[PDB]
Assembly symmetry: D3
Homo-oligomer: 237 residues x 6
């Protein structure tokens, strides 16, 4: 009963790190994710992780408050980096070899994203955190996830969410919605389901980047997914 993936791209949204107040970072959560990621690395899995920033800032939201869209998306990106810092530290304190790279060159705090070094690091059993997303405004860390996954030739992008997977509708606002166990792009687009930003998904589809949606707040789920069990939704075609 060994793992069914060699290299994966873990997409961690900003919310995932949110405590109970709705903002910031919750030390306890980070530590738990570190233990889970750790188990995967021990299991011989090469882990790349793209983190979001919803717990701190979103360019759109700021833009609405009157701020320039580009600068909003910049601050939002810096936020992803601020999260990566937290994730990395947790990994380190748990004695897991990891390194933070940023699309937005941030000398001192971490090194800049380098596809070459990224791969080398991956082939050396080190967790590689890709913050600052794609580095461009008008994009979501989800795109970053798909882009970085195609780049590092990940076997699959695991989209962590506070939900067991993809439902016929929002399973928290419509007690009728049912989860899917298997899905294909054409279907997701056909029935117009919510998996992620269209651009990021279009890209994943264009390169047949399998996507799996699972719940990150469900202890063990991560492991079950990589160990090929019944967890969340699978997206391919």
């Amino acid at each position: 009963a060994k793992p069914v993936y060699k290299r994966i791209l873990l997409k961690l949204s900003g919310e995932a790190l949110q405590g109970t107040e709705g903002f910031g970072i919750d030390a306890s959560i980070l530590d738990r994710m570190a233990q889970e990621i750790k188990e995967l690395v021990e299991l011989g899995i090469q882990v790349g992780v793209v983190i979001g920033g919803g717990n701190l800032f979103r360019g759109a939201g700021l833009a609405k408050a009157g701020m320039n869209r580009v600068v909003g998306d910049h601050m939002g990106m810096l936020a992803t980096v601020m999260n990566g810092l937290a994730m990395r530290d947790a990994l380190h304190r748990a004695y897991v070899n990891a390194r933070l790279m940023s699309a937005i060159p941030l000398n001192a705090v971490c090194d800049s994203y380098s596809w070459a070094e990224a791969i080398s690091l991956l082939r050396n059993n080190r967790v590689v955190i890709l913050s600052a997303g794609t580095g461009n405004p008008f994009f979501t860390t989800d795109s970053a996830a798909c882009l970085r996954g195609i780049e590092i030739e990940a076997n699959v992008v695991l989209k962590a969410t506070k939900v067991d997977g993809v439902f016929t509708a929002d399973p928290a606002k419509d007690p009728t919605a049912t989860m899917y166990e298997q899905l294909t792009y054409s279907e997701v687009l056909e029935k117009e389901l919510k998996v992620m930003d269209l651009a990021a998904f279009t890209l994943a589809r264009d390169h047949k980047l399998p996507i799996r949606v699972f719940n990150m707040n469900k202890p063990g789920a991560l492991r079950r997914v990589v160990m090929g069990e019944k967890e969340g939704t699978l997206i391919t075609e």
Copy 2:
């Protein structure tokens, strides 16, 4: 026919003063400070501005939750940049020439701190924002405020806080908390009042750098200081 009592200042904007209820950044406070800073610039005053990050993260805070103290300060310093980004945008949208420099090289998002480049810019009547403080862990922005304040040879360091001046304690927690209106670097010590952190204080005292503590949540407060009018607490030799 009054006219300003200062030629070039070092304005320290505390991050906490950018919250405006509930963490995050308060767009409206930002828009207001751009206006008040705009007036000073039209008034011919050169403005260097050190910004804090208390509204997002404090190294020490994170450390107690378990994070590595040094990574905590890094996140903290990165918050100042995030705040420096929003403050610059407010300036720009108010049509005020401003540039953002960071102690830790961000590149692209903003400029790296360049002492010489900062002097030139101030001379050409442009607001120079300094984020990432001193750029070293274990220090505060108050320290940077003094350090940069001396570097650019500012006439005084205006510490913009949330209260009218230096009090005998947190006026929000101790009903028995009075503020002073005059202090010598001595008195502050021979009374051990809450102004900054000895390291920064000593620095200013060392170079006979006056300090004035005032409230930025008070519209027009800054201008009054600039016009030499009864405002906040003055700290001199």
Copy 3:
């Protein structure tokens, strides 16, 4: 007493359009575009220009020959810079204030892309060339053209190609290839015409960013577009 119909544009110069017979760069086309760009600048038009690299390398091309797709796009992106270098030189030798920025930091050879710095420069009537496109593999310059076009808030993206406009096919290969003169982001799709690559197209549609496709191998073509005269194909909502 006509005068320009645009204040600030995003000129996308395809690399292939710089060949002029046999790969490489055609000095004479370069000298000519500097002249036509010089007129627009004297005409008061702010010019941001995204340049391609089709005359030297295309990631996808190299990939089929066996190279790593990502290293291929890198080479590709580096070609755009090489083209950005020659275009800037032509501008300079024509006495036109121009600066070259790269998505991937070259430093020394040219400047790193700085959104803010780009806005300032355009405002001071200086040509801002953007090379290395989006700076990420798997994307085209057309994408960058739209991405940057939106960033600097350009009035329109002028895609400078080798043909008079968007055709039903490659007019050089399909004798049955007609071009249109008007299209809605819709029609382009509900006809599936050759304009760009959905990713870039969608982007422009998303932000109601008009696009006009014209021939740069036609001396004076650009100016006519700028003067709002029957030229190329117009793509709007």
Copy 4:
């Protein structure tokens, strides 16, 4: 009889490298320090070394000659880097794994200071040289020593000096002064003894960073100190 320290921060003043003319660097001295440092690394000790610049330049001294204080401190910092280069080379020629990092980003000659990589390097038995001090003007490499020591969580900062330790007065200008074998901050400050720049010391005290003053020109002293013998003065509290 094994070592009593696991990780130490070696503070080497500029003078230490001075030949007999009073300036520059003396090849012979460097080589000797390299052999001693080497022995420590072989002994399993993780060594971090902060070097000064007194043998070349001091910002204050230059300032007095009329030069700007900030630029003086800059040149002085560059000097620390110039020394590090020399120290590193010596370490390399003696086949000791070492790396120079600079607070002032100096691409090519060495890499920039990165707390993360610094620690990783330390955990890999490599000597880590921290030049350019803290990177800020108005500071001494002594502060840098204390700051870098607290950061890398060094077990103790060993302050090398051309004296056996801390005396009741200058043991070279008052034949009565006696050396201390043990001291505490409060005492040093109480009797106002000379250990180092007040700021650097205040910082060390604030974080209980044990400090040991010993003679670097006394062959073997370094080893005796780390091997817990009767050498120089100890400072804790």
Copy 5:
């Protein structure tokens, strides 16, 4: 019958990578050179490789077309980098440990040239590619070859050419010319033979950097040269 060189500097001209059209890169050729370089590394040889850009651009040629000489040499340098990218990829796909460094800092695509790291990498059996030449205009990659060879203390610079070696004249335009098996600088200069740019050669002579000219299109030649056989011409004194 083991190798007679421990560390070599392989000078690969741009032409060497040229397909049959006269320009660009030929995937097939790269792959073959990768296999040969691979054999050398397996053989315990430390390989440093300086690549040219003649297959893409030469500053002089561009200058003649009217472009600024400096910018011409810049684009030409970027070309060397574009080749290095190709060479590196080939090495990687052939599972040979290699790294591209550039004299012209090119963050992301590769790292910048660092003599220190270069040597460390060499001592670790990794191919080190030195692109962007010397980094200065008015120089040839040949100089770069000699300069980088003296720096990395290479045992010899192997100048690959599409000719078996150095002839009394051009062996392709004068069927009488004969190849030399052994030569000395004084002789090359005396009889004024074509080996490389005078500057690069003067430098090599000044430091007694043995030079060997051989044919790179002659499968096995590389190996024969390093295995001390009868191949090409030797240049020393």
Copy 6:
């Protein structure tokens, strides 16, 4: 009504000429050169200035003492920057617009060398100092002086030494040492005189770049050269 005989020059200031008795930098010589350079700038002369480091370190010197030659040149090159820092400060304190660029990127302390940026600056009547010479080991600043001199298209390279002109030997060591007042790149060779180092000399000869050697320890010497008056030795074709 004389007026200058040059529009733009390349002033090579030897480091040794900044000692003024005993190594180090002589504040008074610095203050004097700022004045003499100030006059040239007010006189409308564009000034690019290559600075040496002979007063602090010479790679070759260190090499003989045992250091790695390459690390020696690095230290050497870093001295030029240190000298470039003090010279810029003198300029600034004399109210002369000046910028310092380094061949090896220092960032923050000064600017990276930017050919284009240097041309723009000279055109806007600002002194552009070039430190770190060519930025490569094994070369001298004299080389950089010629290399940069050609790059910026200077009218002549003024080598500022410690003696009145090119002598038949060191006038301080050989009583039988006469200087010339006219030389052809030829004579210099067909007499093998002490002007620079063939590499740099050849370079200037290559591009018909005249050279004039004069004494900077002679107040007003520079201006006389600039005014085309009997001063130093002239080296032309």
